[PDB]
Amino acid sequence: HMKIDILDKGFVELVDVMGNDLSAVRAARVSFDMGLKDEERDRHLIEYLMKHGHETPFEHIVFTFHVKAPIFVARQWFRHRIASYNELSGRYSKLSYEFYIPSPERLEGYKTTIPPERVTEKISEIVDKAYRTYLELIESGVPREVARIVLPLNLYTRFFWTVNARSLMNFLNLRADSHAQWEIQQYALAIARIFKEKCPWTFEAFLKYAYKGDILKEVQV
Amino acid sequence: HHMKIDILDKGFVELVDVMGNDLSAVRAARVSFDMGLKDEERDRHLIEYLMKHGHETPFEHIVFTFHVKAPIFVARQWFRHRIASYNELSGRYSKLSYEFYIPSPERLEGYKTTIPPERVTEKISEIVDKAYRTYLELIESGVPREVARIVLPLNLYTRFFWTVNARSLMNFLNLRADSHAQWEIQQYALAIARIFKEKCPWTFEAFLKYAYKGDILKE
Amino acid sequence: MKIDILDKGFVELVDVMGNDLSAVRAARVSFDMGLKDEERDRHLIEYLMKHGHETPFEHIVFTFHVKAPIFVARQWFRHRIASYNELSGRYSKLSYEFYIPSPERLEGYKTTIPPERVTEKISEIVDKAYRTYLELIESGVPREVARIVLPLNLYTRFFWTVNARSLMNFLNLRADSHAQWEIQQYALAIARIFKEKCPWTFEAFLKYAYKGDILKEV
Amino acid sequence: MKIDILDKGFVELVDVMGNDLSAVRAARVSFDMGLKDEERDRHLIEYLMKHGHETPFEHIVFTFHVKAPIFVARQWFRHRIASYNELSGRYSKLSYEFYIPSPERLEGYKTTIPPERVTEKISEIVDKAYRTYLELIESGVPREVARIVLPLNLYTRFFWTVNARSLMNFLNLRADSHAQWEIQQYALAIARIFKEKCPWTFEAFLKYAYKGDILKEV
Ligand SMILES: Cc1cc2nc3c(=O)[nH]c(=O)nc-3n(C[C@H](O)[C@H](O)[C@H](O)COP(=O)(O)OP(=O)(O)OC[C@H]3O[C@@H](n4cnc5c(N)ncnc54)[C@H](O)[C@@H]3O)c2cc1C
Ligand SMILES: Cc1cc2nc3c(=O)[nH]c(=O)nc-3n(C[C@H](O)[C@H](O)[C@H](O)COP(=O)(O)OP(=O)(O)OC[C@H]3O[C@@H](n4cnc5c(N)ncnc54)[C@H](O)[C@@H]3O)c2cc1C
Ligand SMILES: Cc1cc2nc3c(=O)[nH]c(=O)nc-3n(C[C@H](O)[C@H](O)[C@H](O)COP(=O)(O)OP(=O)(O)OC[C@H]3O[C@@H](n4cnc5c(N)ncnc54)[C@H](O)[C@@H]3O)c2cc1C
Ligand SMILES: Cc1cc2nc3c(=O)[nH]c(=O)nc-3n(C[C@H](O)[C@H](O)[C@H](O)COP(=O)(O)OP(=O)(O)OC[C@H]3O[C@@H](n4cnc5c(N)ncnc54)[C@H](O)[C@@H]3O)c2cc1C
Ligand SMILES: O=c1ccn([C@H]2C[C@H](O)[C@@H](COP(=O)(O)O)O2)c(=O)[nH]1
Ligand SMILES: O=c1ccn([C@H]2C[C@H](O)[C@@H](COP(=O)(O)O)O2)c(=O)[nH]1
Ligand SMILES: O=c1ccn([C@H]2C[C@H](O)[C@@H](COP(=O)(O)O)O2)c(=O)[nH]1
Ligand SMILES: O=c1ccn([C@H]2C[C@H](O)[C@@H](COP(=O)(O)O)O2)c(=O)[nH]1
């Protein structure tokens, strides 16, 4: 399965997909009691749909992704309500030592009172101390659902995400944009790369006529 | 894959595609404990467990796309199910064909009426023919399609694509595969259940035994 | 507020929760703040609209009572992010209420048949279909079956609860020349009520987010 | 109506549209009718609940203002049929407010170390994490990056707009012993407010549709 590594321990993996560019073509044509025609006229229809705001046909293309990301990234991601999610539980699972530790280059462009290297080390210390406490609590009999409240927001979680192409394009408009947090931007770029490979016509038409973000127009795949 | 079931006099329900199966739900449920699939036996058992206890989100990862031909009055009820995607034939854009649902006398099989049931079928076909001819005359005279079609009756057939996940589909079956729903849509619901059963046997059986609230599927 | 539409239709406002300030407060919570001043607050609404910050507007909710022809309702009910409760032809005996277009509805079209004749032809179908409907029910045919002979111009009634964000989507799509003329009229009524209750949001919407054309011309 | 929850949290009702009669009006439209009388209207609410006619309750809408720990909010925000606007760690400097469980939270569990010490250990990490956070911010580190060291018990604040149907789903799932104790407390507060504003609906809900366990015990 296509799997793209993100951040230091994260990833985005495509699990399954239903439909393709032609699915949208057929769904649009039913309006006129028609179906598919030719690869030329059909690709042209996708462009027409995109530039005129005919979005419902794209709801028939559905993706399911497997994602590993820090909780602070997931919190933002899960705000996209038009989708389905199933996530790893801290109430039910003993948590592993997997945290997002940003490299010094994450602070590139900002003037700091201390070396970027120090910030990275400072974050690492908090992680170590918090996880150590988490383990001490669980080993002592503290219920998992309580012990985990001391763990930081950079803890990695895992989830399945099923979303249709229309909602996915909304996600890209909002997250594959410089105003979004850099960390989720990286995930949106991976999502875009997978989208591009499975629905090339839809993706191209989207970038040329509907995309309202900036990064996908300044970054290849 | 593909399956097609004929409904009423000229309708049908066709499965266009499907993403996921019973194991998709098992996997989605297991992620909670950082696990995946296990064994054929423990997995089917997990499905019954999810159904029994109301853990419904794992079933959202199973998605179906159907192609349906049904009368407008049936489609009006169907389209009230908001958690789904639809694309339908348009009377504003397309010239409409002579295709209407004419109930057989058997539709009234059980009701005592003043005039013969055969008469009812005749009366309906007559009004349908009159309305359709009027529609054609208007169209032929240059009246815009969107206006000319307002004289067409509710039994006119329409066609649409329906993409829906298993969770919403189960809600649809609870409400439509039931004696309280109109008979005509009960027929379509039975076809939908028939296809659901074929593609997700474990989920369907678990649904029927522990969560299904309707009655016709248990008969 | 009630506005008459078409020949027998209407749009009536039943209830409303929130106002322009509801969106301001919802927006300010991001920075752990609330309301400020009448001037700063309106500027914020414009800011939200201009930059596509739409979620704050979901906290403003409206409930309308609408009477419209079924062909109009079919299009309206395609708007899934909303709540609906409608009159039932399965349960209620239907009244003689149909939308009959006036000749003026065909202005701009050259027809082989005089516009007035079109109105008459539609009235004819309505009368014959309704009479058939009544005859069937009086004979013993269940309502849910007898009503299938009634035309798409039959009037229905429904309650519609929708938040401002979904309402703006509705206006973008229906208060537009590409939408069927009949629903455009309802959209204009909906817009008028929206403007009355949330003038800042409505004005900002028209200036920076509205994608339709008619509200710009009317 | 404001109710304190946990050590520093709360649930407050901000606004509400409709009441029990809104559902009655919405339901009766099916038979082209309106309200009747107290006795008949209360009876209809029970009938709807008993037979699963849930859409009429979507016309009752509530807006709450809630302050809860992030781990509670993560569970809460999984309820998609609702609207949310929340405090942002990317844009605002975060305050020193965390949920520190009191020793009683461990009542019933067998631990090797006194419960009071568990409370003490949690406070220690919280203190260290927050200090680290402040140190980074004052050194020029962007807020969105500095906050990643903060634990899941940090309090957040949000506005929640939800209709009665979705609210009842939330109570079925959260006002239940299988839900985390912390969110059960919030659900009990939400339930109290719901009961005060829509007593007929709440009573019918508890009698015919509620699938949880605690609301039948408390
Ligand atoms: C740069 C950035 C900064 C942000 N800052 C904050 C912040 O400070 N605080 C905060 O709380 N959130 C914040 N968010 C989250 C934001 O408010 C949305 O929750 C998030 O973008 C999900 O978007 P959505 O509503 O468009 O998508 P979805 O929830 O997936 O919805 C997709 C579409 O369906 C719609 N829709 C879905 N549900 C409803 C509904 N109930 N009513 C009306 N329309 C609906 C709309 O057309 C929507 O675009 C931020 C997001 C970004 C990208
Ligand atoms: C026998 C029968 C008689 C009926 N009679 C009438 C009638 O007289 N008048 C009439 O108007 N309708 C009538 N209906 C339609 C009914 O009101 C629903 O619109 C229809 O059943 C679709 O169901 P749903 O809301 O459960 O499904 P969906 O719209 O697909 O929703 C699925 C689930 O998501 C939910 N959900 C979706 N949207 C919202 C929302 N906005 N707020 C809260 N929860 C939401 C609920 O948990 C719901 O069960 C009837 C249906 C049946 C089966
Ligand atoms: C001029 C015109 C012509 C039309 N012609 C046709 C036709 O020929 N055939 C036909 O079938 N329909 C047709 N429609 C209906 C159209 O396909 C939509 O169903 C209708 O506009 C409702 O819009 P909506 O999806 O944006 O709104 P809502 O359903 O209210 O949704 C609002 C927002 O939430 C979203 N959203 C809701 N549900 C989902 C979902 N499941 N997946 C992804 N995003 C979602 C999107 O961001 C959306 O804009 C037409 C509409 C117009 C205005
Ligand atoms: C005790 C408990 C343990 C849990 N454990 C986990 C866990 O380990 N991992 C995890 O990921 N989650 C877990 N959850 C969250 C759970 O999976 C749901 O996300 C949460 O209960 C929100 O419920 P909901 O979907 O019913 O509500 P909403 O999202 O508010 O939806 C309300 C109704 O609309 C519906 N609906 C909304 N969207 C859709 C859709 N896309 N398709 C079909 N129907 C839809 C259904 O009828 C639904 O009941 C847990 C919840 C509880 C109460
Ligand atoms: O870029 C952002 C900022 C905020 N939020 C939503 C996510 C959380 O629900 C809440 C606070 O997010 P943070 O700013 O703390 O990440 O608002 C996002 O979705 N994206
Ligand atoms: O069994 C029913 C009855 C009604 N409705 C919804 C469909 C329409 O939006 C409106 C009226 O439907 P009819 O009763 O006329 O079919 O209410 C259904 O979905 N199913
Ligand atoms: O302007 C339009 C045209 C179509 N449709 C949706 C409504 C129906 O579900 C179906 C066919 O509508 P008509 O074209 O027949 O009105 O497509 C709309 O919502 N608006
Ligand atoms: O009782 C629970 C357990 C889990 N989850 C959802 C919330 C998060 O998205 C993810 C993990 O939650 P925790 O178990 O870590 O709280 O699953 C809930 O909504 N409620």
PDB file of N, CA, C and O in Angstrom, chain A residues 157-187:
ATOM      1  N   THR A 157      -0.680   9.087  17.825  1.00  0.00           N
ATOM      2  CA  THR A 157      -1.861   8.251  17.880  1.00  0.00           C
ATOM      3  C   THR A 157      -2.002   7.660  16.477  1.00  0.00           C
ATOM      4  O   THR A 157      -1.245   8.014  15.578  1.00  0.00           O
ATOM      5  N   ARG A 158      -2.952   6.752  16.291  1.00  0.00           N
ATOM      6  CA  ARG A 158      -3.172   6.121  14.988  1.00  0.00           C
ATOM      7  C   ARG A 158      -4.662   6.063  14.711  1.00  0.00           C
ATOM      8  O   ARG A 158      -5.451   5.810  15.625  1.00  0.00           O
ATOM      9  N   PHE A 159      -5.051   6.258  13.452  1.00  0.00           N
ATOM     10  CA  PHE A 159      -6.472   6.189  13.122  1.00  0.00           C
ATOM     11  C   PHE A 159      -6.761   5.857  11.667  1.00  0.00           C
ATOM     12  O   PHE A 159      -5.885   5.974  10.795  1.00  0.00           O
ATOM     13  N   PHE A 160      -7.979   5.393  11.427  1.00  0.00           N
ATOM     14  CA  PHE A 160      -8.451   5.125  10.074  1.00  0.00           C
ATOM     15  C   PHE A 160      -9.366   6.299   9.739  1.00  0.00           C
ATOM     16  O   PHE A 160     -10.131   6.756  10.592  1.00  0.00           O
ATOM     17  N   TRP A 161      -9.275   6.787   8.505  1.00  0.00           N
ATOM     18  CA  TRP A 161     -10.064   7.916   8.042  1.00  0.00           C
ATOM     19  C   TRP A 161     -10.719   7.569   6.709  1.00  0.00           C
ATOM     20  O   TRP A 161     -10.022   7.280   5.733  1.00  0.00           O
ATOM     21  N   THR A 162     -12.047   7.569   6.664  1.00  0.00           N
ATOM     22  CA  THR A 162     -12.743   7.302   5.408  1.00  0.00           C
ATOM     23  C   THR A 162     -13.413   8.625   5.060  1.00  0.00           C
ATOM     24  O   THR A 162     -14.105   9.229   5.881  1.00  0.00           O
ATOM     25  N   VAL A 163     -13.185   9.083   3.834  1.00  0.00           N
ATOM     26  CA  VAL A 163     -13.650  10.398   3.426  1.00  0.00           C
ATOM     27  C   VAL A 163     -13.887  10.409   1.916  1.00  0.00           C
ATOM     28  O   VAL A 163     -13.154   9.729   1.180  1.00  0.00           O
ATOM     29  N   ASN A 164     -14.903  11.141   1.454  1.00  0.00           N
ATOM     30  CA  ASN A 164     -15.143  11.195   0.009  1.00  0.00           C
ATOM     31  C   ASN A 164     -14.347  12.323  -0.612  1.00  0.00           C
ATOM     32  O   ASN A 164     -13.795  13.164   0.094  1.00  0.00           O
ATOM     33  N   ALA A 165     -14.266  12.335  -1.940  1.00  0.00           N
ATOM     34  CA  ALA A 165     -13.441  13.336  -2.605  1.00  0.00           C
ATOM     35  C   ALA A 165     -13.830  14.782  -2.396  1.00  0.00           C
ATOM     36  O   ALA A 165     -12.957  15.652  -2.397  1.00  0.00           O
ATOM     37  N   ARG A 166     -15.121  15.053  -2.214  1.00  0.00           N
ATOM     38  CA  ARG A 166     -15.568  16.419  -1.990  1.00  0.00           C
ATOM     39  C   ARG A 166     -15.062  16.910  -0.636  1.00  0.00           C
ATOM     40  O   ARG A 166     -14.515  18.003  -0.516  1.00  0.00           O
ATOM     41  N   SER A 167     -15.239  16.093   0.401  1.00  0.00           N
ATOM     42  CA  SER A 167     -14.768  16.487   1.717  1.00  0.00           C
ATOM     43  C   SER A 167     -13.238  16.541   1.746  1.00  0.00           C
ATOM     44  O   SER A 167     -12.648  17.363   2.429  1.00  0.00           O
ATOM     45  N   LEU A 168     -12.599  15.668   0.966  1.00  0.00           N
ATOM     46  CA  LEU A 168     -11.154  15.632   0.906  1.00  0.00           C
ATOM     47  C   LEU A 168     -10.663  16.935   0.263  1.00  0.00           C
ATOM     48  O   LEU A 168      -9.666  17.503   0.703  1.00  0.00           O
ATOM     49  N   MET A 169     -11.365  17.426  -0.754  1.00  0.00           N
ATOM     50  CA  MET A 169     -10.945  18.689  -1.363  1.00  0.00           C
ATOM     51  C   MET A 169     -11.117  19.843  -0.364  1.00  0.00           C
ATOM     52  O   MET A 169     -10.314  20.773  -0.342  1.00  0.00           O
ATOM     53  N   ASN A 170     -12.150  19.786   0.480  1.00  0.00           N
ATOM     54  CA  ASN A 170     -12.321  20.834   1.486  1.00  0.00           C
ATOM     55  C   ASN A 170     -11.131  20.750   2.446  1.00  0.00           C
ATOM     56  O   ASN A 170     -10.550  21.764   2.838  1.00  0.00           O
ATOM     57  N   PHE A 171     -10.773  19.526   2.834  1.00  0.00           N
ATOM     58  CA  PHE A 171      -9.635  19.315   3.724  1.00  0.00           C
ATOM     59  C   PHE A 171      -8.363  19.935   3.119  1.00  0.00           C
ATOM     60  O   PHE A 171      -7.611  20.618   3.810  1.00  0.00           O
ATOM     61  N   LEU A 172      -8.145  19.707   1.825  1.00  0.00           N
ATOM     62  CA  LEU A 172      -6.953  20.246   1.162  1.00  0.00           C
ATOM     63  C   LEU A 172      -6.977  21.773   1.087  1.00  0.00           C
ATOM     64  O   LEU A 172      -5.950  22.427   1.284  1.00  0.00           O
ATOM     65  N   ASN A 173      -8.139  22.344   0.802  1.00  0.00           N
ATOM     66  CA  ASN A 173      -8.261  23.800   0.759  1.00  0.00           C
ATOM     67  C   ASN A 173      -7.832  24.410   2.084  1.00  0.00           C
ATOM     68  O   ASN A 173      -7.177  25.454   2.128  1.00  0.00           O
ATOM     69  N   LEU A 174      -8.212  23.755   3.175  1.00  0.00           N
ATOM     70  CA  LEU A 174      -7.917  24.275   4.500  1.00  0.00           C
ATOM     71  C   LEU A 174      -6.588  23.896   5.121  1.00  0.00           C
ATOM     72  O   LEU A 174      -5.999  24.698   5.847  1.00  0.00           O
ATOM     73  N   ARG A 175      -6.112  22.687   4.842  1.00  0.00           N
ATOM     74  CA  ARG A 175      -4.888  22.194   5.450  1.00  0.00           C
ATOM     75  C   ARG A 175      -3.631  22.249   4.585  1.00  0.00           C
ATOM     76  O   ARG A 175      -2.524  22.262   5.119  1.00  0.00           O
ATOM     77  N   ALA A 176      -3.801  22.242   3.267  1.00  0.00           N
ATOM     78  CA  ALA A 176      -2.657  22.347   2.365  1.00  0.00           C
ATOM     79  C   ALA A 176      -2.636  23.840   2.081  1.00  0.00           C
ATOM     80  O   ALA A 176      -2.899  24.293   0.963  1.00  0.00           O
ATOM     81  N   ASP A 177      -2.366  24.591   3.140  1.00  0.00           N
ATOM     82  CA  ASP A 177      -2.336  26.047   3.094  1.00  0.00           C
ATOM     83  C   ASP A 177      -1.377  26.558   4.158  1.00  0.00           C
ATOM     84  O   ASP A 177      -1.270  25.984   5.245  1.00  0.00           O
ATOM     85  N   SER A 178      -0.689  27.654   3.854  1.00  0.00           N
ATOM     86  CA  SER A 178       0.292  28.201   4.774  1.00  0.00           C
ATOM     87  C   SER A 178      -0.260  28.690   6.110  1.00  0.00           C
ATOM     88  O   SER A 178       0.501  28.847   7.064  1.00  0.00           O
ATOM     89  N   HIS A 179      -1.568  28.928   6.190  1.00  0.00           N
ATOM     90  CA  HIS A 179      -2.154  29.388   7.448  1.00  0.00           C
ATOM     91  C   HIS A 179      -2.355  28.226   8.420  1.00  0.00           C
ATOM     92  O   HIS A 179      -2.474  28.436   9.620  1.00  0.00           O
ATOM     93  N   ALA A 180      -2.404  27.008   7.891  1.00  0.00           N
ATOM     94  CA  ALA A 180      -2.559  25.826   8.735  1.00  0.00           C
ATOM     95  C   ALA A 180      -1.230  25.547   9.432  1.00  0.00           C
ATOM     96  O   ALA A 180      -0.173  25.998   8.975  1.00  0.00           O
ATOM     97  N   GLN A 181      -1.269  24.825  10.547  1.00  0.00           N
ATOM     98  CA  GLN A 181      -0.031  24.519  11.249  1.00  0.00           C
ATOM     99  C   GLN A 181       0.885  23.702  10.342  1.00  0.00           C
ATOM    100  O   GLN A 181       0.445  22.773   9.658  1.00  0.00           O
ATOM    101  N   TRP A 182       2.166  24.052  10.339  1.00  0.00           N
ATOM    102  CA  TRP A 182       3.136  23.368   9.491  1.00  0.00           C
ATOM    103  C   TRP A 182       3.046  21.846   9.544  1.00  0.00           C
ATOM    104  O   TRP A 182       3.106  21.181   8.507  1.00  0.00           O
ATOM    105  N   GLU A 183       2.888  21.295  10.743  1.00  0.00           N
ATOM    106  CA  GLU A 183       2.797  19.851  10.888  1.00  0.00           C
ATOM    107  C   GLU A 183       1.633  19.228  10.113  1.00  0.00           C
ATOM    108  O   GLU A 183       1.813  18.202   9.465  1.00  0.00           O
ATOM    109  N   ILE A 184       0.444  19.825  10.155  1.00  0.00           N
ATOM    110  CA  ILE A 184      -0.654  19.208   9.416  1.00  0.00           C
ATOM    111  C   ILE A 184      -0.517  19.489   7.930  1.00  0.00           C
ATOM    112  O   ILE A 184      -1.029  18.742   7.108  1.00  0.00           O
ATOM    113  N   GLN A 185       0.195  20.561   7.584  1.00  0.00           N
ATOM    114  CA  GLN A 185       0.433  20.875   6.179  1.00  0.00           C
ATOM    115  C   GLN A 185       1.181  19.702   5.543  1.00  0.00           C
ATOM    116  O   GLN A 185       0.915  19.333   4.396  1.00  0.00           O
ATOM    117  N   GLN A 186       2.131  19.132   6.283  1.00  0.00           N
ATOM    118  CA  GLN A 186       2.926  18.016   5.766  1.00  0.00           C
ATOM    119  C   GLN A 186       2.028  16.823   5.487  1.00  0.00           C
ATOM    120  O   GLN A 186       2.161  16.161   4.459  1.00  0.00           O
ATOM    121  N   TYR A 187       1.095  16.551   6.397  1.00  0.00           N
ATOM    122  CA  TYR A 187       0.157  15.462   6.167  1.00  0.00           C
ATOM    123  C   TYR A 187      -0.765  15.745   4.967  1.00  0.00           C
ATOM    124  O   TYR A 187      -1.072  14.845   4.186  1.00  0.00           O
TER     125      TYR A 187
END
